[PDB]
Amino acid sequence: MAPLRKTAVLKLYVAGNTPNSVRALKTLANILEKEFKGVYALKVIDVLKNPQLAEEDKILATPTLAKVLPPPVRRIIGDLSNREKVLIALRLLAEEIGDYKDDDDK
């Protein structure tokens, strides 16, 4: 649970290959691969394939957007099929990360 500087870890919880999960994954991954390339690390958790992991993180809905790192974990719930919401939410989260500096270095 050690906070990371600059690079943040975003986890997407999906269920199989449903249109909602496919849409959400394409939207989040593409935005992170181009819009936030090199800034965020994307992690995808398949709740149906590994329900044990889903239960461990108490995932009762899919897809679910959550920033596991840096802590606290940011859970974002809404229409992720819309690229604007994914982009806007990622942008706001990134600003928070940039604001937090390890040291002034002066």
Domain at 91, CATH number: 3.40.30.10
HSE-CB of 13 using CA atoms within 13 angstroms? 23
Residue 19 tokens, joined: 């249109």
* Non-local CB neighbours of 55 within 8 Å, separated by 6+ positions: none
Obtained via which technique? NMR
Torsion of CA 13, 27, 25, 79, to 10 degrees: 40
Residue 40 tokens, joined: 């965020």
Are 32 and 90 in contact by the 8 Å Cβ rule? The answer is: yes
HSE-CB of 76 using CA atoms within 13 angstroms? 21
As to burial, measured by CB atoms within 10 angstroms (0-12 exposed, 13-18 middle, 19+ buried), residue 83 is: middle
Domain hosting 60: range is 1-106
Total number of domains in the chain: 1
* Non-local CB neighbours of 48 within 8 Å, separated by 6+ positions: 15, 16, 54
